[PDB]
């Protein structure tokens, strides 16, 4: 409770809020955009670099790292103290 | 061309609901109890007068 | 070995550019030459409610 807000990428903040039960996203994805692997402006390697990165977009390369690093839920989310005052009573 | 599609979000804390010891006092005032009590003991003592 | 659609136009001279709802993969991205992708997209699975 330091920081009300915190503004960043999707992917990381739907993470940490997957990991931590105190976190929360609002959703509402605005400035939809993709991560890329940057290179230089002349580089032989780029033109075989996003033909392999489609070709595993293409398979279920991706998707398996998707459920390997990314896609696993550890908390998502009347209960007793609710009711506790008429107990104390 | 873009490995992970994403965008840009806000994250917050949780803050869940804070569920206190007075949870069922909270529809009438602490000055309702002396209202009350007058209410009962006024008119049990005139009721057996 | 022959292209149709408007990758097929592209491939022989016949149009520049081609915009629509055309989908990129690994064939087409190795015929001709594609740009950064402006809307999300993929396979979805979809049924009744
Ligand atoms: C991108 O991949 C292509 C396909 O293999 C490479 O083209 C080959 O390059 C080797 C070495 O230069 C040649 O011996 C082959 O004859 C080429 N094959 C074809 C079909 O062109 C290309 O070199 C790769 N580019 C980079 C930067 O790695």
Same mark, same amino acid.
């Given at each position: +409770?330091?920081?009300h807000? @915190?503004?960043?990428d999707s992917?990381?903040?739907?993470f ?6 105190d976190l929360?996203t609002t959703?509402?994805?605005?400035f /939809?955009?993709? @991560?890329? &692997?940057?290179?230089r402006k =002349?580089?032989?390697?780029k033109? +075989? #670099?996003?033909? $392999? &990165?489609?070709? $595993?977009?293409? +398979?279920?390369?991706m998707?398996?790292? =998707?459920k390997?690093? #990314? /896609? ?7 209960? @007793?103290?609710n009711?506790?005052?008429? @107990?104390?009573? | 061309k873009? %490995? ?20 069922f006092?909270?529809? %009438?005032q602490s000055?309702?109890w ?6 009962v ?5 005139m009721?057996?007068? | 070995?022959?292209?149709?659609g *408007? ?9 520049? *550019?081609?915009?629509?709802?055309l989908?990129?993969?690994?064939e087409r991205?190795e015929?001709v ?6 809307v999300?997209?993929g396979?979805?699975? *979809?049924?009744?409610?």
């Amino acid at each position: +409770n330091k920081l009300h807000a @915190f503004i960043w990428d999707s992917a990381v903040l739907e993470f940490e809020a997957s990991q931590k039960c105190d976190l929360v996203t609002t959703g509402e994805l605005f400035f /939809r955009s993709g @991560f890329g &692997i940057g290179m230089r402006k =002349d580089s032989p390697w780029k033109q +075989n #670099v996003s033909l $392999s &990165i489609l070709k $595993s977009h293409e +398979n279920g390369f991706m998707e398996d790292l =998707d459920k390997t690093w #990314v /896609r696993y839920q550890e908390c998502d989310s009347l209960t @007793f103290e609710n009711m506790a005052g008429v @107990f104390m009573l | 061309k873009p %490995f992970k599609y994403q965008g840009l979000t806000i994250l917050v804390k949780k803050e869940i609901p804070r569920s206190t010891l007075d949870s069922f006092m909270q529809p %009438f005032q602490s000055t309702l109890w002396l209202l009350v009590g007058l209410s009962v003991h006024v008119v049990a003592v005139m009721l057996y007068l | 070995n022959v292209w149709n659609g *408007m990758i097929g136009e592209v491939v022989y001279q016949r149009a520049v *550019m081609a915009v629509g709802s055309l989908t990129i993969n690994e064939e087409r991205s190795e015929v001709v030459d594609f740009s950064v992708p402006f809307v999300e997209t993929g396979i979805s699975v *979809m049924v009744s409610r």
